Design an enzyme around this catalytic site. Structure first.
Site, PDB file in Angstrom:
ATOM      1  CD  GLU A 168       0.429  -6.297   0.631  1.00 21.90           C
ATOM      2  OE1 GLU A 168       0.514  -7.257  -0.081  1.00 21.90           O
ATOM      3  OE2 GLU A 168      -0.425  -5.669   1.018  1.00 21.90           O
ATOM      4  CD  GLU A 184      -3.045  -2.838  -0.524  1.00 21.77           C
ATOM      5  OE1 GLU A 184      -2.352  -3.142  -1.594  1.00 21.77           O
ATOM      6  OE2 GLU A 184      -3.598  -3.767   0.243  1.00 21.77           O
TER       7      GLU A 184
HETATM    8  O1  LIG Z   1      -5.540  -9.031   1.075  1.00 24.48           O
HETATM    9  C1  LIG Z   1      -5.882  -7.956   0.447  1.00 24.48           C
HETATM   10  O2  LIG Z   1      -7.371  -7.775   0.576  1.00 24.48           O
HETATM   11  C2  LIG Z   1      -4.782  -7.193  -0.084  1.00 24.48           C
HETATM   12  C3  LIG Z   1      -3.671  -7.201   0.673  1.00 24.48           C
HETATM   13  N1  LIG Z   1      -2.550  -6.312   0.282  1.00 24.48           N
HETATM   14  C4  LIG Z   1      -2.359  -6.640  -1.429  1.00 24.48           C
HETATM   15  C5  LIG Z   1      -3.627  -6.697  -2.092  1.00 24.48           C
HETATM   16  O3  LIG Z   1      -3.501  -6.988  -3.602  1.00 24.48           O
HETATM   17  C6  LIG Z   1      -4.632  -7.665  -1.739  1.00 24.48           C
HETATM   18  O4  LIG Z   1      -5.872  -7.478  -2.259  1.00 24.48           O
END
Ligand SMILES: O=C(O)[C@H]1CNC[C@@H](O)[C@@H]1O
Ligand SMILES: *[C@@H]1O[C@H](CO)[C@@H](O)[C@H](O)[C@H]1NC(C)=O
Ligand SMILES: *[C@@H]1O[C@H](CO)[C@@H](O)[C@H](O)[C@H]1NC(C)=O
Lengths: 385, 74
Positions: free
Chosen positions: A67, A185
Site C-alpha cells: 500500500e 491482499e
Molecule cells: O486493515 C487491515 O486489515 C489491513 C490493511 N492492509 C494492510 C494490513 O497490514 C492490514 O491488516
C-alpha cells in the site's frame, strides 16, 4: 504510529518451512521505505536477505512495498509511482544477478480505487510495468470499526466490488494490456476485520461472492487476508480451529475448476440471488470431464428453488449446501455441510466432504441466507474437456 | 413464486484462473509476535494449510515497509 523492527534468519526459516511442508508458494514482500539521499530505494538490506535465501536454496517469490499510496500518511514520505517503477527495475536486476534469476516479481500492492490510487498505479505500470509478472492490488468492503451485520448481508455492498475491478482493469488495459491481475491482499473489512462478523458464517457471503466476481471478471489469483493471525478475518483462529470461511475455501478448492463459465437469473433482479459457473475441478476423483460446478448465494429471507436450463434439466446433481451450526445462526463460528457439522477428525486429518445427491429433475433448493455448490454430473460440456 | 430460471454460457472458457486461484496471506506483523516460531510450527495448522495447496502464501502487510533483516540476530 508504526516503527522499524528487525527479524532473524530464524524468522525466515520458520516462514519457509511453514509454506514448504504445507505445499504453498511463498511470496515475500520487501521493505520499500529504505531510502538513499535522492529518495531512491536502498537495495543493500534486501541484498543481504537474498544472499541468505539463495545460500539456503529457498524457492521464493518477491514483492516490494505494501500500500505505497499510504507512505505519506504512514511514514511522512511520498514516493511517486514513477520512482516505485524505477525501484522495481533495480530489484529485477538484483533478482536476475541471483541464483533463482527466473524468480517471479509482483506489485505494487496498491489500495483499491476508492483510495485515489489510479495516478500512482498508472505511473507505476508505465515506469516499471515491464519487470512485474502480475499486477497486485488490495480490496476491503468495509471499515471493521463501523461494519454492521446488515452490511455483510447487503447485495448493494457486494456490488461496489464490480466497479472496483472495472476501474483497475481500466488503468491496466491503458498501460500493460494482457498483464495478469491479482488481488494481492483482500477480505471483508479493514483494520483487522469486523469483530463477531469477519469470523462467522456471515463472512461467507462477501468471501464466496468476491471469488465468483474475481474469476468472472478475469482476476487470476485472490489472496485471502489472513490464513492465521490477530485479525478477525482469519480463516483459522488463535486456537488453530478452522472458521466457516476456511470450510468454504476447502469446499471451493475441491469442486471448482480453472475454466470460468457464466450463469445468470432470468429476473430483472440478479441482486439477492447470485450465481457462478465453472467446469468441475478435474483433480477431484469423483467427477469426469464435461461436469459443471454451479455455486449460488441466497440473500433473500426465504428459500429459492433454482431450475437448470436445457439441456441440463434432467441431470444428476450433488448438493453441497453450507448452513451455520446454531444457536448463533449467521453469527456462528461453526458450519454444517448437508446437515453434518464440519470438523477435523484429528490434528492430522480433515473430514470427508459428503455430497447430497438430488433426484434427477428436482429444482435446486437454496434456503435463505445460505450458499451452496451444485455439481452437474455428466453435463458433458465440451469446453470443460 | 420462489422458483428462479438460470441461464448458462457453456460454449467456451470465458477465463482461466490459476490453480492457486484461492490463495492466502500472513500479515508481516505476525513476525513481531514472540510466539511466531511456535505458531507456524503448529502441526494442526499445517494440516489446515496443506488442505489449500496449491496456493500462494503472501507475507506482507503494513509492517512490510517497517521490517529490517538482521542476520546477526537470534
Ligand atoms: O486493515 C487491515 O486489515 C489491513 C490493511 N492492509 C494492510 C494490513 O497490514 C492490514 O491488516
Ligand atoms: C544504504 O544503507 C546502508 C545501511 O543499511 C548505509 O550504510 C548506506 O550508506 C546506504 N547507502 C546509500 C547510498 O544511501
Ligand atoms: C422479508 O423481506 C421483506 C422484503 O422482501 C420484508 O419487507 C419483510 O418484512 C420480511 N418478512 C416479513 C414476514 O415481513
Amino acid at each position: 504510529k508504526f516503527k522499524n523492527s528487525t527479524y532473524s534468519r530464524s524468522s525466515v526459516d520458520v516462514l519457509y518451512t511453514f509454506a514448504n511442508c504445507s505445499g504453498l508458494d511463498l511470496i515475500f514482500g520487501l521493505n520499500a521505505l529504505l531510502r538513499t539521499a535522492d529518495l531512491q530505494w536502498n537495495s543493500s538490506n534486501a541484498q543481504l536477505l537474498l544472499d541468505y535465501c539463495s545460500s539456503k536454496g529457498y524457492n521464493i517469490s518477491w514483492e516490494l512495498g505494501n500500500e505505497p499510496n499510504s507512505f505519506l500518511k504512514k511514514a511522512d514520505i511520498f514516493i511517486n509511482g514513477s520512482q516505485l517503477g524505477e525501484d522495481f527495475i533495480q530489484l529485477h536486476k538484483l533478482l536476475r544477478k541471483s541464483t533463482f534469476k527466473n524468480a517471479k516479481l509482483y506489485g505494487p500492492d496498491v489500495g483499491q480505487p476508492r483510495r485515489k490510487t489510479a495516478k500512482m498505479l498508472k505511473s507505476f505500470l508505465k515506469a516499471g510495468g515491464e519487470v512485474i509478472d502480475s499486477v497486485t492490488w488490495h480490496h476491503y468492503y468495509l471499515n471493521g470499526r463501523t461494519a454492521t451485520r446488515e452490511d455483510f448481508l447487503n447485495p448493494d455492498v457486494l456490488d461496489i466490488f464490480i466497479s472496483s475491478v472495472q476501474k483497475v482493469f481500466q488503468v491496466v488495459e491503458s498501460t500493460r494490456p494482457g498483464k495478469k491481475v491479482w488481488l494481492g491482499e483482500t477480505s471483508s473489512a479493514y483494520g483487522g476485520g469486523a469483530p463477531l462478523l469477519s469470523d462467522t458464517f456471515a463472512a461467507g457471503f462477501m468471501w464466496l461472492d468476491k471469488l465468483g466476481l474475481s474469476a468472472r471478471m478475469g482476476i487470476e489469483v485472490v489472496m485471502r487476508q489472513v490464513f492465521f493471525g490477530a485479525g478477525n478475518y482469519h480463516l483459522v483462529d488463535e486456537n488453530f480451529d478452522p472458521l466457516p470461511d476456511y470450510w468454504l475455501s476447502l469446499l471451493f478448492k475441491k469442486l471448482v475448476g480453472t475454466k470460468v463459465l457464466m450463469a445468470s437469473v432470468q429476473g430483472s433482479k440478479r441482486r439477492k440471488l447470485r450465481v457462478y459457473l465453472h467446469c468441475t475441478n478435474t483433480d477431484n476423483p469423483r467427477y469426469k470431464e464435461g461436469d459443471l460446478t454451479l455455486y449460488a448465494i441466497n440473500l433473500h429471507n426465504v428459500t429459492k428453488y433454482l431450475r437448470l436450463p436445457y439441456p441440463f434439466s434432467n441431470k444428476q446433481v450433488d448438493k453441497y449446501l453450507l448452513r451455520p451450526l446454531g444457536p448463533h445462526g449467521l453469527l456462528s463460528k461453526s458450519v454444517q455441510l448437508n446437515g453434518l457439522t464440519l470438523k477435523m477428525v484429528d490434528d492430522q486429518t480433515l473430514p470427508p466432504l459428503m455430497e447430497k445427491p438430488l433426484r434427477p429433475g428436482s429444482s435446486l433448493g437454496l434456503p435463505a441466507f445460505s450458499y451452496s455448490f451444485f455439481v452437474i454430473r455428466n453435463a458433458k460440456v465440451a469446453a470443460c474437456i | 413464486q420462489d422458483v428462479v430460471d438460470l441461464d448458462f454460457f457453456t460454449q467456451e472458457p470465458l477465463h482461466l484462473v490459476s490453480p492457486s486461484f484461492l490463495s492466502v496471506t500472513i500479515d508481516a506483523n505476525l513476525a513481531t509476535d514472540p510466539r511466531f516460531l511456535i505458531l507456524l510450527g503448529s502441526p494442526k495448522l499445517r494440516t489446515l494449510a496443506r488442505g489449500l495447496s496449491p496456493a500462494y502464501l503472501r507475507f506482507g502487510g503494513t509492517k512490510t515497509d517497517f521490517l529490517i533483516f538482521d542476520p546477526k540476530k537470534e
